[PDB]
Amino acid sequence: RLITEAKQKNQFYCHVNLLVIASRKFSGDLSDISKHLALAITAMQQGEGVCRIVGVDLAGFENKETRASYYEHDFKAVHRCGLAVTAHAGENDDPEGIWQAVYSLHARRLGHALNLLEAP
Amino acid sequence: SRVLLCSAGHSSMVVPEAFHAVPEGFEEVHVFTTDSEKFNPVVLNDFFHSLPNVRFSITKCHGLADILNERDFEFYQEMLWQWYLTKMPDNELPYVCLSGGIKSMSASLQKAATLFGAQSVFHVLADNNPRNIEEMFDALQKGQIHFIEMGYEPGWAALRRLKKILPINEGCSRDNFKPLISKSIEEILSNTGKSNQLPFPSLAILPPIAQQWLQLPLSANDGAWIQNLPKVDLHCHLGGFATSGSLLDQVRGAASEPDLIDRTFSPQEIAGWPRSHKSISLDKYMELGNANGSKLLKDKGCLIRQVELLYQSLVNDNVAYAEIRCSPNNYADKNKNRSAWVVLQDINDTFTRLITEAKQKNQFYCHVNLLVIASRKFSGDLSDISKHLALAITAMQQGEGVCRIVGVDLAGFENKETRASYYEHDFKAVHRCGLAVTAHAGENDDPEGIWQAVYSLHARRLGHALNLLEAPDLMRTVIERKIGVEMCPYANYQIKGFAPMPNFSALYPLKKYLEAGILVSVNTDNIGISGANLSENLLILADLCPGISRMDVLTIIRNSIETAFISHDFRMELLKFFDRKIYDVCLISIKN
Amino acid sequence: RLITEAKQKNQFYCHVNLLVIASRKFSGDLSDISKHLALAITAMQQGEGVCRIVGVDLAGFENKETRASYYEHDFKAVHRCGLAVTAHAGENDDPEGIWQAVYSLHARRLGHALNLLEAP
Ligand SMILES: Nc1ncnc2c1ncn2[C@@H]1O[C@H](COP(=O)(O)OP(=O)(O)OP(=O)(O)O)[C@@H](O)[C@H]1O
Numbered sequence: 031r032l033i034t035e036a037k038q039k040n041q042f043y044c045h046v047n048l049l050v051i052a053s054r055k056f057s058g059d060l061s062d063i064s065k066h067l068a069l070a071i072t073a074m075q076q077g078e079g080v081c082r083i084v085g086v087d088l089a090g091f092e093n094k095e096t097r098a099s100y101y102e103h104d105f106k107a108v109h110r111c112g113l114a115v116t117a118h119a120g121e122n123d124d125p126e127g128i129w130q131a132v133y134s135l136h137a138r139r140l141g142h143a144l145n146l147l148e149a150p
Numbered sequence: 151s152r153v154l155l156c157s158a159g160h161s162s163m164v165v166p167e168a169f170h171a172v173p174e175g176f177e178e179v180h181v182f183t184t185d186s187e188k189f190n191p192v193v194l195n196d197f198f199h200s201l202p203n204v205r206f207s208i209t210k211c212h213g214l215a216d217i218l219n220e221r222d223f224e225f226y227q228e229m230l231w232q233w234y235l236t237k238m239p240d241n242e243l244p245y246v247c248l249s250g251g252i253k254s255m256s257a258s259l260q261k262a263a264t265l266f267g268a269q270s271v272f273h274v275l276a277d278n279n280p281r282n283i284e285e286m287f288d289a290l291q292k293g294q295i296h297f298i299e300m301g302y303e304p305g306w307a308a309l310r311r312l313k314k315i316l317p318i319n320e321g322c323s324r325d326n327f328k329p330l331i332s333k334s335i336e337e338i339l340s341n342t343g344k345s346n347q348l349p350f351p352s353l354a355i356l357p358p359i360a361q362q363w364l365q366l367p368l369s370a371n372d373g374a375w376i377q378n379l380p381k382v383d384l385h386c387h388l389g390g391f392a393t394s395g396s397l398l399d400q401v402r403g404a405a406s407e408p409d410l411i412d413r414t415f416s417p418q419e420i421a422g423w424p425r426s427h428k429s430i431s432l433d434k435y436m437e438l439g440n441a442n443g444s445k446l447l448k449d450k451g452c453l454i455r456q457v458e459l460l461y462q463s464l465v466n467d468n469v470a471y472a473e474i475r476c477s478p479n480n481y482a483d484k485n486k487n488r489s490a491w492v493v494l495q496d497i498n499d500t501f502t503r504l505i506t507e508a509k510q511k512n513q514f515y516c517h518v519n520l521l522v523i524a525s526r527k528f529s530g531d532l533s534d535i536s537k538h539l540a541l542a543i544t545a546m547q548q549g550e551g552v553c554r555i556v557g558v559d560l561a562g563f564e565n566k567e568t569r570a571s572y573y574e575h576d577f578k579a580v581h582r583c584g585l586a587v588t589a590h591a592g593e594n595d596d597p598e599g600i601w602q603a604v605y606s607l608h609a610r611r612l613g614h615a616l617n618l619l620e621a622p623d624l625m626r627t628v629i630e631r632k633i634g635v636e637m638c639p640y641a642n643y644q645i646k647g648f649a650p651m652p653n654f655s656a657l658y659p660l661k662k663y664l665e666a667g668i669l670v671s672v673n674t675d676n677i678g679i680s681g682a683n684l685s686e687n688l689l690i691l692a693d694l695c696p697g698i699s700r701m702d703v704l705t706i707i708r709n710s711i712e713t714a715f716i717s718h719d720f721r722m723e724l725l726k727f728f729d730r731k732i733y734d735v736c737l738i739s740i741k742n
Numbered sequence: 743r744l745i746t747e748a749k750q751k752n753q754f755y756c757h758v759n760l761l762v763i764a765s766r767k768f769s770g771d772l773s774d775i776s777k778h779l780a781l782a783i784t785a786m787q788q789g790e791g792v793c794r795i796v797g798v799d800l801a802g803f804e805n806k807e808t809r810a811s812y813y814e815h816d817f818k819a820v821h822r823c824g825l826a827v828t829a830h831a832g833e834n835d836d837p838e839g840i841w842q843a844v845y846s847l848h849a850r851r852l853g854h855a856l857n858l859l860e861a862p
């Protein structure tokens with residue numbers, strides 16, 4: 031509604047798309063990841079609307095146990111339905127985690143990871 | 151009412167004390183007797199003339215005396231039974247006395263009173279056995295006549311439609327002797343599983359005659375009881391409800407856009423439907439439903455009309471709980487913003503509104519839930535399966551509602567290209583969330599696929615599974631885990647063929663399935679295409695599985711309740727309501 | 743023998759079936775679990791007898807070191823032959839352990855599990 035209102039005035043407007051986060055709550059309510067993924071998958075399919083859902087997020091509590099090879103069982107269909115995946119890693123994790131996140135989750139983008147220089 | 155029934159013998163003056171038995175006065179006295187010359191009705195007529203408000207009826211068994219012969223005994227028994235049936239109050243039990251008559255008629259009348267109800271049966275005893283009226287009057291003045299009763303006799307709450315089906319029959323003889331209940335009495339004990347398969351614990355309170363009636367085998371003429379029977383349908387397809395006829399016409403008439411309706415094509419007619427005399431294939435079975443389906447259900451108004459008509463049919467068939475299989479993607483259309491989620495939401499809100507409006511008026515309402523069909527290789531890419539699962543879990547996540555989403559479904563064409571061991575990894579999340587799976591592991595599917603469905607998909611139900619009898623280990627684990635097996639009698643009979651199908655040798659395995667202990671449930675699949683609702687689906691079992699019993703049908707209903715995906719508290723309430731209704735229906739069933 | 747002796751005199755008798763307990767060691771001779779499973783399968787294959795073998799107990803130290811994500815491929819064998827499995831995950835365990843003990847070991851019956859209240 032805001033985008034259409036701004037566009038009708040012919041004034042400069044800011045197109046905005048939404049990303050559904052998947053909080054890494056770890057032990058608590060393990061079904062939350064599946065619920066969020068399915069919510070995003072079915073929400074991107076509304077179709078009509080200048081604003082839409084274009085991908086999901088993997089931010090949350092980063093840990094060795096919470097690596098990309100821990101939730102990888104649930105992502106077999108996010109790419110199947112045409113979604114996109116970002117990630118948040120490298121702030122405190124291991125370059126192996128970043129490597130698997132790049133190659134297992136097929137993350138098109140990546141968050142932070144300021145220590146890339148140490149891994150040519 | 152306050153109607154007496156008595157037998158007149160040599161002691162013909164026993165009626166006046168029977169009239170005086172009540173402590174507040176009496177209304178109508180009726181007496182039955184034989185054709186012997188010993189009885190003198192003049193004395194009783196003169197005695198009762200002092201109370202003209204009392205209806206005196208005297209009937210004599212024509213051509214009978216002394217009841218000295220077995221043929222005479224049965225003649226007297228049948229006339230007495232007919233007279234009792236034609237001489238009872240419509241909706242109250244009468245008062246009956248039997249002190250007059252020899253042991254034969256007395257015992258017959260007592261058994262008849264037990265057999266048709268009586269407000270109070272008693273006996274009159276006199277120390278000196280008075281003959282003249284003044285003598286027994288003086289006797290009652292002191293109190294010589296004592297009163298002996300064994301208690302109130304409820305009889306059976308409903309047996310009197312014998313007098314409707316059997317007319318007065320004033321002109322009759324020994325030739326048209328009706329042994330209607332005697333064979334039921336003969337088969338009471340003449341005929342372990344059938345002994346303690348008793349569901350619905352209140353059936354124990356039910357009187358024994360109707361219990362043994364339930365123990366009798368099923369018959370075609372029990373359609374009235376079957377229709378009055380509260381049932382459960384778990385395998386029901388929304389897309390095959392209306393396919394032809396007035397239902398299809400009125401479903402078409404409510405569409406939002408008439409110009410998008412093909413009002414010309416109609417399905418090909420099959421002679422003898424639903425009792426198909428020739429075997430049919432799955433392709434023709436589905437082609438019979440071509441007039442309806444996703445090609446016609448896109449219109450929102452048409453969808454609402456179809457859902458309302460299906461719910462009305464469910465309520466009409468006395469179904470007290472149902473689960474509907476639906477395909478939201480098939481009815482979606484991005485042209486009019488009709489996403490699959492929107493279609494499913496429309497169905498859910500329509501069902502919830504219908505149920506609430508039916509419950510507000512305190513009528514019989516069919517609580518219904520939805521099943522999300524996830525077909526295999528039906529529309530192209532297999533990502534549609536993931537889309538269906540995601541939609542189903544998101545829909546169940548609504549939280550609050552009345553008509554909810556119990557779980558998902560897995561349906562395919564035959565085999566191989568639609569095997570049940572392809573999508574475990576996709577199913578992990580949806581099955582973890584808390585839904586349920588009913589894999590269609592059956593209909594010429596090898597036992598290995600059924601094993602994968604049971605043990606890797608954790609499927610709680612199996613569609614059809616007709617050929618389960620050839621896998622003893624798979625059977626054993628199915629019964630050991632109480633996995634529901636939905637079976638559609640008419641549909642499988644039409645598309646596969648079972649005895650008494652012409653030129654067929656195989657027979658339906660439902661009886662052996664029930665004897666083994668499988669939690670079998672009887673369903674309808676596609677009402678419109680098969681042309682048979684739940685009532686005739688259950689009725690056809692008499693000629694499909696010979697020797698099937700009524701208690702077996704009740705256990706089928708119990709199993710259908712057992713295998714449904716519902717919460718514990720809702721299951722308890724449903725069980726209580728079903729048990730009370732079942733008791734009422736079997737109380738008023740032996741009436742006919 | 744005891745059951746037949748009690749039954750032949752037409753007196754109240756107690757039918758008894760045995761469960762082979764797959765003892766938890768996790769320290770040495772780890773083949774003992776497979777040996778126990780084979781012994782239980784062969785024992786149930788006797789067939790005749792009022793008293794028989796109907797199940798296998800997964801008892802022992804139910805701590806995280808011996809959860810249900812270890813030998814499920816081995817329990818495929820016992821599940822194949824139509825033999826019941828009883829688990830034991832009731833003392834000092836997480837809801838995750840109970841969950842995949844139910845859904846991977848296919849435990850048809852569960853032991854203890856006193857803390858189900860906190861896992862709706
Ligand atoms: N994808 C877009 N994102 C943001 N603005 C857009 C987009 N597409 C079109 N517009 C708008 O189209 C309008 C065209 O304006 P125009 O070419 O006449 O230049 P202007 O009016 O002189 O200055 P301004 O670009 O600031 O409006 C712009 O104002 C711009 O905001």
Ligand SMILES: Nc1ncnc2c1ncn2[C@@H]1O[C@H](COP(=O)(O)OP(=O)(O)OP(=O)(O)O)[C@@H](O)[C@H]1O
Pocket residue numbers: 752753754755756757
């Ligand atoms: N599966 C069983 N388990 C235990 N006992 C059984 C079983 N099957 C039969 N029985 C025995 O059958 C016997 C039948 O006994 P009956 O019906 O005559 O009653 P009772 O002798 O008066 O009292 P009781 O039941 O204590 O023996 C019972 O004693 C019962 O112990």
Ligand SMILES: [Mg+2]
Pocket residue numbers: 385387613675
């Ligand atoms: Mg079906």
